[PDB]
Paper text:
The first enzyme in the pathway, peptide O-xylosyltransferase (XT, EC 2.4.2.26), catalyzes the transfer of xylose from uridine diphosphate (UDP)-α-D-xylose onto serine and thus determines the site(s) of GAG attachment on the core protein. To better understand the initial step of GAG biosynthesis, we have determined crystal structures of human XT1 complexed with UDP-xylose and various PG-derived acceptor peptides.
In contrast, position −1 has a wide tolerance for uncharged amino acids, accommodating even large aromatic residues such as tryptophan. The substitution of glycine by tyrosine at position −1 (peptide 4) causes a similar widening of the peptide binding cleft. The tyrosine side chain packs against the side chain of F498, displacing it by ∼1 Å. This is accompanied by a flip of the peptide bond between positions −1 and −2 of the acceptor peptide, which, however, does not affect the conformation of the glutamic acid side chain at position −2.
Author numbering:
A (entry chain A): 253 to 310, 317 to 729, 735 to 959
B (entry chain B): 213 to 219
The structure:
């Protein structure tokens, strides 16, 4: 289906060669040809503002007689439902309104949000849901539709529109926010970049044409900035009053119409659409150059072009706050009422500090305040949303818990804590305590074999410590995947790895003169897979590197060693698990053999290091090498025993509880433990509205 | 205050 016009632009040709679907290629071709004929983008726009330039207009203790009612639009994604609930508790008041958009790809979070909206009459969920990728044009589409929806809800007489993410948190009380906005109810709060505007346009790619399709932002070519209007932008977090939102939504004048068209094909549209419209509209004199937010920008860490695979551009994102940042929420310089970003899996202590600062400590004896639970798998989403790696390992963790139940009962006769596993895991949680990862919580079903009854259980597994130092600047060493360069940690928190994974080695360093070290990767039968030196500059805090290891990796316990002139410094270990599932079905002999017998070539790398095995005392045993070939052919129960002995060597079943009635007389009820996802977690629990109108 | 960082 050739295009409507000759497509010659290098960027369009690149997008068409990378796009995955026909529909996308079609829309790419259509957009490019429309723009080539000059019928897609407006070329001149009317300015209605009577000011020569920008306005820049210029206390929270009083009690207003006519307090504003706020429409909070929450645009949320991911797994952090309990943190969302905690933040919702802090910002909730019975007189405001909450309209929650959950990313189409975040079905677990959406189910949790529905429980909230079913509880409270002033909480609703968008029935439509977009896949709001980073920088996507769909984010402006999401705000504009939510504004239209909210203006049509006549039962909700709201005065301001405030957008928040699940990583935002208030830094002042609701009372102070309402008092401030009630005094300035005719103003709009938007923060501009304030620096050179030509540089802003170029860095934002505003003079480039983009198209969102297939959950990707395709760069299609250049375009002109329309004449007659001033273009501006900055933060996409703002507070807009109802009168301005009505203008944006229902006006058909030249400015709004053409800007809606222009920004349908714009990267990061929400960082400049509302600025450009406001400054060129009849409301230009209402603009306050302050979005009342603190955004934790840190360009040295947050600008790693980390979204290069989602958008045809390089971007930056704010860092997560840490405890050392608490004093920044107490600045009196300018009015500020919210901040971002906060992530409980990164640092929950600063969240707790902030929440108790605003609304007081919880009563003594309140449980769970230093804990965090985050669901990373939920049964309604299906085992096909897991990978073969995580399905394999979650199954193994459950069986590890069942063995702990059996061995924890000391009886002469029939063991009433012996179980047979049933089906697949029902849910998996990450578990953190005092900002330390504690491992996984697996909820699973099993038959109690003494009474022959199905029971629902939860197992806590914790990884064994493997980092070992020897007689320096090295503080830690870890192997993982999905390294987050902004937050300097692996987002695959358990280090779960399969034979087809490409592991990454990380080192953490303290201050001191520059130094060079040697890293050596050792596979489970003592084959040296890779060796390299790395410079550790005096200012370096983290280093990492993904060695090019031919796949598949031999399963078992690998070791990574760090040397300093052949002097041992430290070592860590990691587990490449053999898989018991292929495409979520039990693995078959021929696939098991091809996956578990080491890399296709003889070695892991073109260069061999057989010369170093005697130097480092890593001799290769023919009897182990042989037993690994025998293991590579195993399936069924034999493969299960190989995997489970590997897992048990690197993981510990810390505890196991029953969710309901149990016949095992030493099993605690989950809700009565301190660690279970069923135990009380009041800081994230939402109850009845109090007489003061609050939940917190 | 903006998130874009060039091509
Ligand atoms: Na509701």
């Amino acid at each position: 289906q050739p295009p409507k016009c000759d497509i010659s632009g290098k960027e369009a040709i690149s997008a068409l060669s990378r796009a995955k679907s026909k529909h996308c290629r079609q829309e790419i071709g259509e957009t490019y040809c429309r723009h080539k004929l000059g019928l897609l983008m407006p070329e001149k726009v009317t300015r209605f503002c009577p000011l020569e330039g920008k306005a820049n207009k210029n206390s929270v203790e009083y009690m207003p007689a006519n307090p504003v009612r706020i429409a909070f639009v929450l645009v949320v994604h991911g797994r952090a439902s309990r943190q969302l609930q905690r933040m919702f508790k802090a910002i909730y008041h019975k007189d405001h309104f909450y309209y929650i958009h959950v990313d189409k790809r975040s079905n677990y979070l959406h189910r949790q949000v529905l429980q909230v909206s079913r509880q409270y009459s002033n909480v609703r969920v968008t029935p439509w849901r977009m896949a709001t990728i980073w920088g996507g044009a769909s984010l402006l589409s999401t705000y504009l539709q939510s504004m239209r929806d909210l203006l049509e809800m006549t039962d909700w007489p709201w005065d301001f529109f405030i957008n928040l993410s699940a990583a935002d948190y208030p830094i002042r009380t609701n009372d102070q926010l309402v008092a401030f906005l009630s005094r300035y109810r005719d103003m709009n709060f938007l923060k501009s970049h304030g620096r050179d505007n030509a540089r802003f346009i170029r860095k934002q790619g505003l003079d480039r044409l983009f198209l969102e399709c297939d959950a990707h932002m395709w760069r299609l070519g250049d375009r002109r900035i329309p004449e007659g209007i001033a273009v501006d932008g900055g933060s996409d977090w703002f507070l807009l009053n109802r009168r301005f939102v009505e203008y944006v939504t229902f006006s058909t004048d030249d400015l709004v119409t053409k800007m809606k068209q222009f920004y349908s094909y714009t990267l990061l549209p929400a960082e400049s659409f509302f600025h450009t419209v406001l400054e060129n509209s009849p409301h230009c004199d209402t603009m306050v150059d302050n979005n009342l937010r603190i955004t934790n920008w840190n360009r040295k860490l947050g600008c790693k072009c980390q979204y290069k695979h989602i958008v045809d551009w390089c971007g930056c994102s704010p860092n997560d706050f840490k405890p050392q940042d608490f004093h920044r929420f107490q600045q009196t310089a300018r009015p500020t009422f919210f901040a971002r970003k906060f992530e409980a899996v990164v640092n929950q202590e600063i969240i707790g500090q902030l929440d108790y600062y605003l609304y007081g400590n919880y009563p003594a004896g309140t449980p769970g305040l230093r804990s965090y639970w985050e669901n990373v798998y939920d049964e309604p989403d299906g085992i096909h949303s897991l990978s073969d790696v995580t399905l394999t390992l979650y199954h193994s963790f459950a069986r590890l818990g069942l063995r702990r139940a059996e061995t924890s009962l000391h009886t002469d006769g029939e063991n009433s804590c012996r179980y047979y596993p049933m089906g697949h895991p029902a849910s998996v949680h990450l578990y953190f305590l005092a900002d330390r990862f504690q491992g996984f919580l697996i909820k699973h079903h099993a038959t109690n074999l003494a009474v022959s009854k199905l029971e629902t259980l939860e197992t806590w597994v914790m990884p064994k410590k493997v980092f070992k130092i020897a007689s320096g600047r090295l503080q830690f060493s870890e192997v993982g995947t999905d390294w987050d360069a902004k937050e300097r940690l692996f987002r695959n928190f358990g280090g779960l790895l399969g034979p087809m994974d490409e592991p990454v080695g990380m080192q953490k360093w303290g201050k001191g003169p520059n130094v060079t070290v040697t890293v050596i990767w050792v596979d489970p039968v003592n084959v040296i897979a890779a060796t390299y030196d790395i410079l550790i500059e005096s200012t370096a805090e983290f280093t990492h590197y993904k060695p090019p290891l031919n796949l598949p990796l031999r399963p078992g316990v690998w070791t990574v060693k760090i040397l300093h002139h052949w002097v041992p410094v430290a070592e860590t270990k990691f587990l490449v698990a053999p898989l018991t599932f292929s495409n979520r079905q039990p693995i078959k002999p021929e696939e098991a053999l091809k996956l578990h017998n080491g890399p296709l070539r003889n070695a892991y790398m073109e260069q061999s290091f057989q010369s170093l095995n005697p130097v480092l005392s890593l001799p290769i045993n023919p009897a182990q090498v042989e037993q690994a070939r025998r293991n590579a052919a195993s399936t069924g129960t034999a493969l299960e025993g190989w995997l489970d002995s590997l897992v048990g060597g690197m993981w510990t079943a810390m505890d196991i509880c029953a969710t309901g009635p149990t016949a095992c007389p030493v099993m605690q009820t989950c809700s009565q433990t301190a660690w279970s996802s069923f135990s009380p977690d009041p800081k994230s629990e939402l109850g009845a509205v109090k007489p003061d109108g609050r939940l917190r | 205050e903006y998130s874009g960082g060039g091509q």
